[PDB]
Curated annotation (Swiss-Prot):
Molecular chaperone that promotes the maturation, structural maintenance and proper regulation of specific target proteins involved for instance in cell cycle control and signal transduction. Undergoes a functional cycle that is linked to its ATPase activity which is essential for its chaperone activity. This cycle probably induces conformational changes in the client proteins, thereby causing their activation. Interacts dynamically with various co-chaperones that modulate its substrate recognition, ATPase cycle and chaperone function. The modification N6-acetyllysine is found at K49, K75. Homodimer. Identified in NR3C1/GCR steroid receptor-chaperone complexes formed at least by NR3C1, HSP90AA1 and a variety of proteins containing TPR repeats such as FKBP4, FKBP5, PPID, PPP5C or STIP1. Forms a complex containing HSP90AA1, TSC1 and TSC2; TSC1 is required to recruit TCS2 to the complex. The closed form interacts (via the middle domain and TPR repeat-binding motif) with co-chaperone TSC1 (via C-terminus). Interacts with TOM34. Interacts with TERT; the interaction, together with PTGES3, is required for correct assembly and stabilization of the TERT holoenzyme complex. ISGylated. S-nitrosylated; negatively regulates the ATPase activity and the activation of eNOS by HSP90AA1. It comes from Homo sapiens. Residues 1-217 are annotated as: Interaction with NR3C1. The chain holds residues 10 to 226 of 732 of the full protein. The TPR repeat-binding motif mediates interaction with TPR repeat-containing proteins like the co-chaperone STUB1. This is Heat shock protein HSP 90-alpha. It is found in: Nucleus; Cytoplasm; Melanosome; Cell membrane.
Length: 217
């Protein structure tokens, strides 16, 4: 059949974000497990936004009433996926919030980290997303907001990310963060380890969380 075409938009990370990513990637931190707490917290926040929005306008849940979080480890692909049915992101929200716009806490957080702060402090500085890079060599974010189409963001750091219209599995609404794990971080695909960390750091959450455990492949 003829050659297909797809548009891709490649963006440069804001300089301090790029520096933070570099620091996260290329420096040893213990306690890397907090990446999961941070992504769950972001899903919980996203779920809060759609829940409150929907109080006033219940048609915001036409894209699905269930408000929850699924964790999906895949040993074959070496990916841990965190899926929520939260508000999601429009394409503008995605490009804005995940890389191009300076974030208030980047500078202060890098100074803290160097000065010896535990990486666990990252969430307090509003840049918790980037803790993904403690364990993942590449992150893909799939997102669908009621007001826009489904988009895929991805980055392996190196100072750039891409956004394109997602040609993968449509979602009704929410965000899916796919962590392509580093070879030495595969413990985060083990159900016992995931359960240990969720229990330890994510007892707060306010929505149902479900771990899907693979039994065939």
């Amino acid at each position: 059949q003829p050659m297909e075409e797809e548009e891709v938009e490649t963006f440069a990370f804001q300089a301090e974000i790029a520096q933070l990513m570099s620091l996260i990637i290329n420096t040893f931190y213990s306690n890397k497990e907090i990446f999961l707490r941070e992504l769950i917290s972001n899903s919980s926040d996203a779920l809060d936004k759609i829940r409150y929005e929907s109080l006033t306008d219940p048609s915001k849940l036409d894209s699905g009433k269930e408000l929850h979080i699924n964790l999906i480890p895949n040993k074959q692909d070496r990916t841990l996926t965190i899926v929520d049915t939260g508000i999601g992101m429009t394409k503008a929200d995605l490009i804005n919030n995940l890389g191009t716009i300076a974030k208030s806490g980047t500078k202060a957080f890098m100074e803290a980290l160097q000065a010896g702060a535990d990486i666990s402090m990252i969430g307090q500085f509003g840049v918790g997303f980037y803790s993904a890079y403690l364990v993942a060599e590449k992150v893909t974010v799939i997102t669908k907001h009621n007001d826009d189409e489904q988009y895929a963001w991805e980055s392996s750091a190196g100072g750039s990310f891409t956004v394109r219209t997602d040609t993968g599995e449509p979602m009704g609404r929410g965000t899916k963060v796919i962590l392509h794990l580093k070879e030495d971080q595969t413990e985060y695909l083990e159900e016992r380890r995931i359960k240990e960390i969720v229990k330890k750091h994510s007892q707060f959450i306010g929505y149902p969380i479900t771990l899907f455990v693979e039994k065939e492949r």
